[PDB]
UniProtKB/Swiss-Prot annotation, chains A, B:
Activity: how regulated: Specifically and competitively inhibited by 2-thiomalate, which coordinates with the catalytic [4Fe-4S] cluster. Weakly inhibited by malonate.
Protein EC: 4.2.1.2
Primary localisation category: cytoplasm
Cofactor annotation remark: Binds 1 [4Fe-4S] cluster per subunit.
Gene expressing this chain: FH2
Highest taxon in the source lineage: Eukaryota
UniProt-annotated binding residues for (S)-malate 1: 107-108, 146, 189, 385, 431-435, 455
Lineage: Eukaryota, Discoba, Euglenozoa, Kinetoplastea, Metakinetoplastina
Organism: Leishmania major
Protein name per UniProt: Fumarate hydratase 2
Residues in coiled coil: none
pH dependence, entry free text: Optimum pH is 9.
C-alpha cells in the first residue's frame, strides 16, 4: 500500500541537456575509489574553490542561448514596439561588451548563491562551505565585480563586508558519488521581485487564476529590468519550499519536470498556463521596460501539492542580468556549463539635454516635453542610493541642510562595480527608483532632488511630488551597465560617505546618457496606462 | 585577507540543551568503520523509518516545556484577561487528553517536514527519502491522525493522497559522520501565517521598524490559534532563505545563536527587539484568541545580512499545535527529543443555545446578546470546509439551488482526524473561518449559512453579510481538538460528498460546545477594536 513518490521527478535530473566544458587538468583533483563494495569519489576540496571561482567569473560576461534568443526575438518581431527593439538592442550590445571579459554585464554583480548536491559517497573532507566561499571570494576580489553584501553590526548599524561575502550555501545530501551544482549570481533588484502570496481553494479555478495572474504581474512593473523570465509556483508544502521552487523555476532548473500530475502529488510544469502567463505578459502593454510586447522572455509555471488548508503561491523573475551556471564534479574532473561567448551573432530621435547649466534651466527644458520623450544627458550626475538617502534624511531631521550636492545636478540612483585598470569607470547602470520614493517629496520640499535618474516605475507619491515642486523622474535603460560605463561615463569621483563602498555619494561626468522622461512636472507618468 | 564566516553560528549546534531519550536497542542499526583514515558510520536505513515513525507519533500527544509554561503563564498572570485564562486552561486540558496517546492534540495533524543533516561520512545507502517517507507513512496510517495532503491531478483537479504524503524532506550535507534531525508536524493554519515582505533600508530605523511590527502582527489575527510563538527575520540572502530562517526560528531551532553582529555578516538573535515584539503583542489587546494579553508565548527575532539593494523580511508563528522534535543518529544509536509526558502538572457564565430548534429560533436567541458573549451549543452541526464550499458554489453557478442541508443547522468549518476504535469521533476542532469568507454573503442570500462556527477573525464582507441577512459568526476556541472530541462530539455521520475524505460534508451531534459570538446580526465584531 505504501508507495514513495518524490515531489520533483525531472526527466533530466543531471541536466544532460546542458553543454559543459571540463576544466583542463582537473582530473587531478578527483580519484574514484571502491569502499565496502560501492563506488566512491575522493574530491580535493581545492576543486570547490577552483569551480566557484570560475563560475562566479564567467557568469558575469556571458549569457545562455534562451536569454539571448529572447532579445533577438524582441528585435525581429514586427509586433514589438520601437521601445522594445531599442531596449533589446541596447542589452545585446551591452552583452557584447561584457563578453570582452573586463566589464561585468551589470554593476550589480549579485549575491553569490550555491545550490550543491553532494552524493553520499562523494568525499570532500567536509569543509565545502569554506572552500566554496574562498572561490567566491577570489572571483569578487580579483575581478572587476562589486562588493554588495551589507553586514548588520546591530539591528540598524550596518557596514559593507568588503568582499561580497557571505554567500548563500545550500548544500544537499543526495545519492551517488558525484557533486552537482547550480551557481546563481542573483541581482538585488530581481531578488526583490520574489513574492509570496497566501491564497485558498477559491483561487483554484480558471477565471480566478487568470485574474490573479493579470493583477500580480503588474506589481512586478519594470523595476527588475525586463524582459523577464517569469516563474509562477502554485502550491507547495511550505512558504519556504514554494519560494525555493519559484527561484529554481526562474533559473529553468525544473524545465524537464513532467507535465501532468498524479494521485501521489508529484510536481509538474503546466505548459497551458505558461502560455496564459505569456499571453497576459504580452497583452499587458508593459513591454521591454518602456511599453510594448516584450514584458517577458518566457514563463515557467509549476504546480505543487498542498496541505488542504493551504495554498502558497510564489512569483519571481530572472532579470536582464540572467546569471546562473550549472556544474558538476565527477570521476573525470570539474565540468562547468558552457555559456554563449559570441553574443554578437544574435544582433540583427532624441532630445539633447545639457546638464552643465543651473538646475532650473534644465528643469525648464525638460518641462517642454511630454512623458515618453527619449533624452540624452550630457554633464554632471550626482550619484546616491539607499543608504545615502537615509543618512541625508537623518541629517535634515537633526536640523542640518540638504547638502549642496543634492541641489546642483540630477540624482542618479546607482552604485558602481570596481574600475578596471586604465578604465574611466567600472560597470555603472541604474538601481531601482521605487526604493527611494519615500525621500522625493521631502527632498524636493527642501530644495533638491528635482531631477532623479534611475529605472523602474515609481509610486503615486513621486508623481504628486514632481507636480507639486516642478520635478522630473528620468528612466534610464535598466541593465546595460557595461556599455554605459564604456561609452557614457567619463569621470568618476567619490564625493561623500566613502565608508559606504559602492553606496557612497559619487560625482560623475557623463556624455550621451540615454533616458526617457517617465514622470514630468505636470502629474503625468508614462506607466500610468500599463501599470495602473 | 580571506576569512570564512558561516552565517549561522549557534553556540549549541548539536542541541545539548535539549533532553533526548535513546531508542532501546537502536545501536544495532549502526556500525563504526574507518576508511582512508577517517571515521565513518554505517547506518541501516531502517533506522530512518523507525525514527520518523516515533517522531511523527510522539509529537501529536506531547509538548515542549516552554509551550506548556506559556499556557500556565496565561493562567497565573494577574494581567491575563479572563478569556486569556479560559483559553489557556482549555488548551492545557486538551493537552492532558492528548497525552493519553489516543487522540492527537489537533485534528490538523499537519504536513510532515523533515530537516535532516547527514554527515559526509554517514552512509545510509542513499535511499533516505523513501525510508523516511515510510516512517511518516507508518505514523499517519497506523495512528488516529489525519490525511491532509492534496494532490493536483491537473492545475485545478485535486484529490487527497490518502496517506499524508508527500513529506517535505530537506536533507543537507554537513561535516562529520552523524545524522541530525528536526521533525515538524506543521499545521496548515500556522503555515498560512508565514509572510514574506520585500522592504528597504527605509524600514531600518527604530521608529519605522516598531510601526512595521505593530502593523504586521495585527495581520496575523487569531486565525492561527494563538498564543503564538512569534518569529521575525529581518534581512536574508534571498526570499527562500529568509522564510526558511523564520520557520526554524519559530521552532526555537536558532535559540543559541550569538546576540551581536560582526563585520562578516553573521546572523544574530536580537533580544532587545524580541522584547519589543512581546510588548507590541501584549499591548495589542488581541489576547489568547478572544481579547487580552496573551497574543504571544514568546518572540524570536533574527537579524540577517542583506544585499544592499534588498531587505526581505519574514514573519511566521508556531500555533497552539506547536509540534517539533529534535533527533540524531550516532555511534550509540537513535536519540529522540524527550517531550513533556505529564502536562497536568502545569494546570493550577455562558448562554445555553439549543440547536435542535428551527434555525430562525436560534437566530432570535443569538440576536439578544452582544458580541463577546460566551455560548454553549447543544445540537446538530453541518460540517463543511474549503472544498465543499467551492463545490456548492460551483453547483449554484450552474443554476442548482443551495442544498437544504446548508439551511437547517449552523455550518461548522472543520475536518476530523480518524476515529479511534470505540470512540464517537476523532479529534475534531475548528478550521480557519477567513478562508470561507467569499461564500457567506452568497449562501445567506440563498437562505443558508446564517450561523457559521469556526475560529479566527473574518473580513469586513462577513460582518456586512451577517448584518444584511440576520446572521452570526461563532468563534470556537482554536486548537482543543482532542477535548472537543472526547467531551462534546457525540455522533458523526457523513451526509454528502463522501469521496472528499475529511473534506466531505458531515452531520454531527454536539453537547456543551463552547464558542463566542464574534459577529452578530447588527454590524458588530468583537475583533473590530483589536484587529482594526
Ligand atoms: S540592475 Fe537590473 S539587470 Fe542588474 S541585477 Fe538589478 S534588476 Fe538585474
Ligand atoms: S492549532 Fe489551529 S492553526 Fe494550529 S494546526 Fe490546529 S487548527 Fe491549525
Amino acid at each position: 500500500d505504501f508507495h514513495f513518490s518524490a515531489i520533483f521527478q525531472p526527466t533530466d535530473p543531471h541536466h544532460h541537456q546542458t553543454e559543459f566544458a571540463k576544466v583542463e587538468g582537473s582530473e587531478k583533483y578527483v580519484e574514484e575509489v571502491e569502499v565496502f563494495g560501492r563506488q566512491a569519489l575522493k574530491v580535493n576540496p581545492e576543486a570547490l574553490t577552483i569551480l566557484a571561482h570560475r563560475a562566479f567569473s564567467d557568469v558575469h560576461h556571458f549569457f545562455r542561448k534562451d536569454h539571448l534568443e529572447g532579445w533577438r526575438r524582441a528585435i525581429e518581431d514586427p509586433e514589438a514596439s520601437d521601445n522594445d527593439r531599442y531596449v533589446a538592442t541596447t542589452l545585446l550590445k551591452n552583452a557584447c561588451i561584457a563578453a570582452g571579459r573586463v566589464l561585468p554585464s551589470c554593476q550589480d554583480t549579485g549575491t553569490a548563491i550555491v545550490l550543491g548536491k553532494r552524493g553520499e559517497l562523494c568525499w570532500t573532507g567536509g569543509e565545502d562551505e569554506k572552500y566554496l566561499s574562498k572561490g567566491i571570494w577570489n572571483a569578487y576580489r580579483y575581478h572587476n565585480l562589486r562588493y554588495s553584501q551589507t553586514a548588520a553590526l546591530d539591528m540598524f548599524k550596518e557596514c559593507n563586508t568588503g568582499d561580497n561575502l557571505p554567500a548563500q550555501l545550500d548544500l544537499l545530501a543526495v545519492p551517488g558519488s558525484d557533486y552537482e551544482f547550480l551557481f546563481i549570481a542573483k541581482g538585488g533588484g530581481s531578488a526583490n521581485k520574489a513574492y509570496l502570496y497566501q491564497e485558498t481553494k477559491a483561487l483554484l479555478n480558471p477565471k480566478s487564476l487568470r485574474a490573479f495572474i493579470e493583477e500580480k504581474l503588474k506589481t512586478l512593473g519594470t523595476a527588475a529590468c525586463p524582459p523577464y523570465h517569469i516563474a509562477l509556483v502554485i502550491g507547495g508544502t511550505s512558504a519556504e519550499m514554494t519560494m525555493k521552487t519559484v527561484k529554481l523555476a526562474s533559473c529553468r532548473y525544473y524545465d524537464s519536470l513532467p507535465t501532468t500530475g498524479d494521485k501521489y502529488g508529484r510536481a509538474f510544469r503546466d505548459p497551458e498556463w505558461e502560455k496564459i502567463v505569456m499571453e497576459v505578459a504580452q497583452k499587458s502593454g508593459i513591454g521591454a521596460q518602456f511599453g510594448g510586447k516584450y514584458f517577458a522572455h518566457q514563463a515557467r509555471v509549476i504546480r505543487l501539492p498542498r496541505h488542504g488548508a493551504s495554498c502558497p503561491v510564489g512569483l519571481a523573475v530572472s532579470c536582464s542580468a540572467d546569471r546562473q551556471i550549472l556544474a558538476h564534479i565527477n570521476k573525470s574532473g570539474i565540468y562547468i556549463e558552457q555559456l554563449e561567448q559570441n553574443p554578437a551573432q544574435y544582433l540583427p530621435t532624441s532630445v539633447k539635454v545639457d546638464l552643465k547649466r543651473p538646475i532650473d534651466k534644465v528643469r525648464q527644458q525638460l518641462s517642454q516635453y511630454p512623458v515618453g520623450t527619449r533624452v540624452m544627458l550630457n554633464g554632471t550626475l550626482i550619484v546616491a542610493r539607499d543608504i545615502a538617502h537615509a543618512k541625508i534624511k537623518e541629517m535634515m531631521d537633526n536640523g542640518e541642510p540638504l547638502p549642496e550636492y543634492m541641489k546642483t545636478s540630477p540624482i542618479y540612483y546607482a552604485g558602481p562595480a570596481k574600475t578596471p585598470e586604465g578604465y574611466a569607470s567600472g560597470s555603472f547602470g541604474p538601481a531601482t527608483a521605487g526604493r527611494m520614493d519615500s525621500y522625493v517629496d521631502l527632498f524636493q520640499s527642501h530644495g533638491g532632488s528635482y531631477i532623479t535618474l534611475a529605472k523602474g516605475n515609481r509610486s503615486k507619491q513621486v508623481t504628486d511630488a514632481c507636480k507639486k515642486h516642478g520635478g522630473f523622474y528620468l528612466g534610464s535603460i535598466g541593465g546595460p551597465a557595461a556599455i554605459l560605463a564604456k561609452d557614457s561615463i567619463k569621470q568618476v569621483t567619490c564625493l561623500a560617505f566613502p565608508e559606504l563602498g559602492m553606496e557612497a555619494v559619487w560625482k560623475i561626468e557623463v556624455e550621451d546618457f540615454p533616458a526617457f522622461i517617465v514622470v514630468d512636472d505636470k502629474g503625468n507618468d508614462m506607466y500610468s496606462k500599463t501599470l495602473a
